[PDB]
Assembly symmetry: D2
Homo-oligomer: 507 residues x 4
């Protein structure tokens, strides 16, 4: 076990042990199956987590809804103060926590640290928002009536997250849901159970130091069984789900079946489009980093690169010369730009996708092979010569394969951006003012993130994050995404002694 | 003979109605589907007929609406607002005859029929201003040389399914908002209010054609479960607004979720009024009366459950019984008439069924419970005491004028009892206690989407969002930022600088 | 003889005007002050007369307005919005004759006169929806059992002083918003547009009287500096909205500040258009012509300064020169006419003086510079090249159709030159450069209240807030949250709990 | 001997203070003006000295701040928020010694000195989130191919003048908001709290310096009326936020108005509490006591007028007297002290004068009214009954702990009496009546900026905008959209279409 090797002793700074309890609700436990998580950079086991049994889930839900009775009564600004302290406790652990993200998930250290910083940043944002959430006081049309839009917590927010952002997506949901007066129940990705435990330990200490019931931020580590329970559980007032479209579809249906609320953040099949007037010294690095970043395992990863015919072959050749320089190595080591895939299965998926892409006329112009070293390393791959509607370019595989397409006119390539089932992120690179505003308008991108001269991964906590179509429609983080965590009521207070009716109806 | 052919009802022609009307409008009028005849519930006489849409009619209409959308979405929202303004004027010019048609085909009294058309006129006048306001913030990017912009664009085609009990206003709320938001609309109204749907569409069609706009911007495809199911399963319907039963809304919500579409669900209510010991009873009794017997108990927001504190229970019931006796019954178009018939013969049959089962469950009918002996679908507005709050008959979704009265003692329990039902539409308390009022409005208070104090559960204005939680389906219509459900948000980052990203050790050119 | 007594102008009666009109309305019509005669600037003939407010008229009008406010403030905002809707319809119905009156008394062409009424109609319809929206947030209190609410209430009496050049729309902007916000209004329009103020007031008064509301809700006291000074010094005028010259607006602003009142100041502009080298010149030339010559150069947003990049300076002046020669001049009601007369004889004399001074400072008149030899106050629309951007004549506030053309090289200096004038109303750049556009909109860009790209300095729409910075005075009208200037904010904490305060060792 | 030179006050050096301190900071520390000595009101002993700003110091500081602004305005608002976050943390780490300095130099009890620093901390943390939120709407243009955008940009240099009674929090409110809004600041604190201003400025200076930012982003120029007047007249001060007396604030408003600047004025309050028949007396009596005697009655929001209904008047006054006798007077740094000295010797004689004047005008001193026989500026907290609501001393603006108590009969007259004073800062009613509470909050209710229910006149939190109406000056600080006063609005139209304007007969 890596945690039992002196090189990884720093894992104990996060309170991690050989075997860890994967259930927290004020108390720590775990009566379900023990899971070992592996370091994808060497395929070695790191440590073990005792996951939630059904009995653990039940006890946790009950204790979190008991906790909600206390927490919902705490003024939102004082809830913000708790979230501020969570930000600070995360700030104090950012290097080791980020290193664990690199160790258990596989992304490079700057992105592991960056993910914790994002949670830090959303906490600091939530502090201010906790003094702002609410609705309008509106002028009633009736004398002696007040008309008020109130917002109240939904109660228990269940949060299912994925392996590729094992800290930040939970942090987005947690910070906003907390200041909105909800309790949280977290089921993280099984293959990032240690990250889930570490984060939960950080939060639990803040809650306990403030003499708040720990179940405000409950954890039930588990897989599809616990997640299915959450989706089915009328006690989970909002289920925020981040993951695959196939799973998210079933989750959305189960929540809809019980008239629950769901917040779905699912796949992206994101395109970058480089027009003829584009700054190629901006296009080439923007595409490389958006395609190879996180080894192509981001929901926002650039999977499709449309290049205008006039510059297609130049951009491809400059991409090859730049791909050749990507520094591959251990994700925690300095100046490493490219790490492993998360699992051995994703390497098998990479190989399958590469063989099928060639079987559809594509030319692997760079990469396409597994790397001959320990861990789940594959070459960042560029495939040209496919048609935009090719089956392989509409399949959903978290693989570092960049499909490059030619295009000729603005209307057709906008349609090509919009033609896929998902709708997360999109980018155009152009200088044409009219084109930019058309891209942003009703006949433009159909995505939740619509970028210009910045790649598909450019997104900051200030705006709402999420997509349309098969991406599932949810939003996280900024703008008024907080309303998804609360219940709107339209309230009328008659403080007079008559009964005027709306629309002047005389009854 | 049909009512429209009787001289008594020559005014139906002023709405463009004929003996047989086309129930499909997409810029042209038609319909190859089943012919339906609607009946006047005040006298069970047939009014006129409508040729409904076939699946092929609906297929053709979707195609023409989405063609129309290419034109409409290019029209600036304020100029779309001007078209909506003209619809509100065109409704104003016909408010009396349209109100009369609502009273005739649906059965609510005239002032409520006109009042429902006024709701549509009001949201039109409201949407005019909103058309110059919809949109999002420009935000400060954390990146130098970047702009961060929240854009809002139309979803495209908004399918609108409505019910019989509000055959004008609910479509009007959806239509005026969806229109200024740059969407085209496709309306499948309630089969038993087909003439109202045709009459409304004829008013809108003239405004669109007078403005040389494609008529499919406000398409109409009359039909029933076949057309509604097609809309729920049609990926081309970007947003499906459904008002109606929880049972059907459940399946519609599932069908839309299965195809990753958008739905806006406005389903039932099982709405409570709670009268605390300090309540002004001169507000309680007229409010409970209107909330329960308005529209013959057929509103989504009708008061079904009357919770009265033990101390004032008998007094309130006695006053309510007396007030019920003073209810003026007649033809819903007649003057001073405050109580009309139920919408259908079936509603009468189910009403008698509910009354009997409530008796079998231990209730006492303290007023009503019988059919009225007169033409049409008239039943006595009915009050039942003595049931437990958990009585099965009081947790049935029946559209009947039966008010279930319960006693209670303390505030915490009756708040929980308000909340214990599946639905969560509207709720009201009568009290003077400041602390009680803010508790009711707070996180431990009513779980409903409409949370009222010292007024009935029904009769919302357009300024706020309208809708419920839980099995009411979660959608919102009309006011506040309800318009966002009709549009798609995009978070847009524009790099306007000459700045290049960090080379990260890579040698570019 | 009065134009109103001639048969060609009988339509004036449709607006309820007669030979001598009452310039005070407070529910009753009157006017014990001096009688003013307004003149058609197209022919210098007298139109009709208006009896202005005496100071006793004004005092009685303030009293009646504040009495009317007690009723009006109690009317729910959305029902006040319905009154404003009806005002929009009443204007809609008289739009042609009221537009024609604006052209007759003020001098602008009919299409703009009608369009000014339509602007009032448009803000009325905007205000109808806004009447269901004005208010503030309910906010989460940091204290358990406390509600925190931001309330907005009418300030009370809104005094409105308007200028001759937009004698309908500016009042309309202030009226519609002030009215849905629960204020009563007192209007003192420009003396030279007194008939228009009376005609507008008659239309609104009919709406109020038909709804059985006190007419003093929209009071009128026609008068000049005497009544305007009284308003500026009157503690009972809770908000004074002033549209006018910077010189007068400065003194109004100080008078209101002296009494701790609220003012809203919409003062002059010295508005620049900047044409960069990459600009679409077929967009620049018509935009510049219509922004400089529209309303005979008498808008607050008129283009006064045309900075052209040195590379295209000569082409644009030449293209502009050929375009000016095609401007159709005539009576402002004649349909083909683009260019009307200036508003007064005095404006002609001052235009000629601005031209001569511009030549003395090194300018070359490349087009115009002269009076036209027809009746009325017509001058040629004028282009002056050769002056430096700091030329004194270029920084004089004169309401004359004189367009000063400057050269420039780079973006930093020309942004600085846009910003160097005392006023800060409107500004426009023409360019295709993405970064330059967003720099123009950013903190190192235009310092004006209106910041336009590829469109001229005039023609704003009701959806946004209208107004300027610096010596333009800071006020905002019309859209966005400009309504907040017409209301008072209160931050309201409601303790609804039974909690006692901490005793701090004291036995209570 | 200076207190700072006495061993028991060695903790003052934890704030970087010494015998004589530089009162000018602009990236460099300096001060060529007059040396001022500040005194501890608990014992009238000198604490330490500050070298104030000369005019040359002011000039150099304005120049350096305007240079710094060119850098600071280019830093993204959220990165400016991160600087303000670190200011919050830096204040956290000094909260105890800084709170103690507030208690020493200004005289308020220690929990309020600490609490004032905590208020700056809290607004910093709030502004961090606000820094990712400030901006305006993108609006739907009525014209095809046009974007319509409401932009907000920093005004530039925000001058901030503050008073003795909140020598940290008021600057904090202005500083944190102005900073995230992209402005640089120039602070002139009250001369008698010069050491507090220096201490705060040292804390901020280290944050700016550690982040390699020019210190003049948060400049300090210690001084009195001469420096404040310079700021009021200086066109380079784009916004002048002033907190102080109405008399000075009026002149500051006039001076800024004279140059077409922006001011934000937070002036006196003459704040009333109203207790109706149905009020919870267990809540009224402590609420009135703490609101009246808090900070020895030297708050802007201090309860000066207490209206009690005739039925409960004598009972409330009796209970107030029993509780007033329990107020623990002492050194403001000593534990469990509720009540400290007045800020100055001058304030004591003012207190004396008002007490005899209330007597002469017909009032009865039921409690207090005398100077206390101890070191420092201690006077007794005073209750005065029997005056009419219009009694002239109750409309005098004194920072004295004198609570004037009045009888009332009905709701209408007492609402009018709350409103009759010249200021309009804070107001409170105690009642259970639901209709009355909404009338109080409505257009016929309180005319103040703060309108409270069952919580006294000092009920304010950073989430809401803070300020008042009428002679209180109109400014707002802290919450809601108060940030907009620190920025300039522009309404921006971008034409991104290839569409040409109508030629209107002209051949371009
Ligand atoms: Cl390159
Ligand atoms: Cl007491």
């Amino acid at each position: 076990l890596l945690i039992n090797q002196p090189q990884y002793a720093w894992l104990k700074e996060l309170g991690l042990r050989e075997e860890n309890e994967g259930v927290y609700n004020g108390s720590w436990g775990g009566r379900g199956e023990v899971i070992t998580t592996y370091c994808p950079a060497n395929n070695e086991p790191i440590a073990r987590v005792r996951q939630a049994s059904v009995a653990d889930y039940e006890e946790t839900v009950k204790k979190a809804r008991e906790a909600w009775k206390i927490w919902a009564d705490i003024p939102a600004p004082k809830r913000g103060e708790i979230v501020r302290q969570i930000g600070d406790a995360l700030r104090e652990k950012i290097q080791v926590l980020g290193s664990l993200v690199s160790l258990e998930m596989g992304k490079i250290l700057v992105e592991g640290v960056g993910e914790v910083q994002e949670y830090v940043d959303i906490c600091d944002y939530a502090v201010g928002l906790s003094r702002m959430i609410g609705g309008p006081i509106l002028p009633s049309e009736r004398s002696g009536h007040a008309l008020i839009e109130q917002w109240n917590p939904v109660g228990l927010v269940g949060i299912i997250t994925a392996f590729n952002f094992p800290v930040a997506v939970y942090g987005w949901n947690n910070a906003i849901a907390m200041i909105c007066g909800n309790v949280c129940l977290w089921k993280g990705a099984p293959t990032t159970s240690l990250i889930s435990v570490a984060v939960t330990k950080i939060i639990a200490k803040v809650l306990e130091d403030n003499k708040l019931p720990g179940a405000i931020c409950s954890l039930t580590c588990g897989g599809a069984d616990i997640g299915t329970a959450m989706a089915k559980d009328e006690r989970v007032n909002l289920l925020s789900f981040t993951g695959s479209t196939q799973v998210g579809k079933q989750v959305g249906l189960m929540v809809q079946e019980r008239f629950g609320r769901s917040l779905l953040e699912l796949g992206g099949n994101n395109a970058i489009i480089a027009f003829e007037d584009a700054d190629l010294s901006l296009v080439v690095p923007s595409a490389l980093f958006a395609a190879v970043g996180t080894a192509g395992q981001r929901c926002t990863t650039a999977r499709r690169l449309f290049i205008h015919e006039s510059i297609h072959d130049e951009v491809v050749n400059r991409l090859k010369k730049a791909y050749a320089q990507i520094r591959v190595g251990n994700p925690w080591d300095p100046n490493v730009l490219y790490g492993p895939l998360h699992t051995k299965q994703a390497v098998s998926m990479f190989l399958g996708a590469v063989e099928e892409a060639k079987k559809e006329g594509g030319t692997v112009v760079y990469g396409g092979k597994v790397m001959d070293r320990p861990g789940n390393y594959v070459e960042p791959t560029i495939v040209t010569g496919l048609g935009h509607d090719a089956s392989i370019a509409h399949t959903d595989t978290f693989a570092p394969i960049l499909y490059v397409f030619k295009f000729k006119n603005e209307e057709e390539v906008f349609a090509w951006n919009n033609e896929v089932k998902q709708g997360l992120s999109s980018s155009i690179f152009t200088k044409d003012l009219g084109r930019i505003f058309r891209w942003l308008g009703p006949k433009g991108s159909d995505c939740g993130i619509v970028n210009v001269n910045i790649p598909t991964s450019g997104a900051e906590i200030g705006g709402a994050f999420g997509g349309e179509k098969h991406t599932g429609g949810g939003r996280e983080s900024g703008s008024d995404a907080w309303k998804q965590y609360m219940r709107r009521s339209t309230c009328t207070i008659n403080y007079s002694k008559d009964l005027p009716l709306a629309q002047g109806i005389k009854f």
